[PDB]
Design a protein that fits this description.
The structure is a homodimer. Chain A is of the alpha+beta class. The first copy, chain A, has one domain. The first copy, chain A, is built from three helices and four strands, in the order E-E-H-H-E-E-H. In chain A, helix 2 packs antiparallel against helix 3.
Amino acid sequence: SSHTVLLIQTSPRLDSRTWGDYESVTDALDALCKMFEDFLTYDVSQVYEFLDKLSDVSMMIFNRETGQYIGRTRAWIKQQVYEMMR
Amino acid sequence: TSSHTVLLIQTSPRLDSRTWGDYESVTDALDALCKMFEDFLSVTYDVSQVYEFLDKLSDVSMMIFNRETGQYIGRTRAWIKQQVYEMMRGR
């Protein structure tokens, strides 16, 4: 499991920036999917749209080889959601 | 030579006090913390007061882009305190 920071900005307001820390990527993705379900029985396209509607979403995922964090973009997160709902 | 920096903050025990900022350099992120320290005091103080403010935040950390690897170094509160001191004193 890789320590993961989820960075979110819900609206164009810069004071809408929030974050959470998770023991694993799967835990972070689970938290993201809960935000979607709360806003919403659904198709994967609706999850993509929910992610597109956030002003910002990204993850920082710990890499045990370097001891540093890899930044992952919204497109990488959509690909993880795609693979979870195959 | 500037490095993109994400500042992660939780000001109080409230989970909803978490926020983050994006900065073009470490200097700009450190100055955000200096401005928070000043705005809490709202400029005559001692270094123990800057450290006290940083210690009383519920959480504070930085993620700093590292050109050598393309990845982000997580810096802890203790490192941030030393860097705030050095930048205020003058490098």
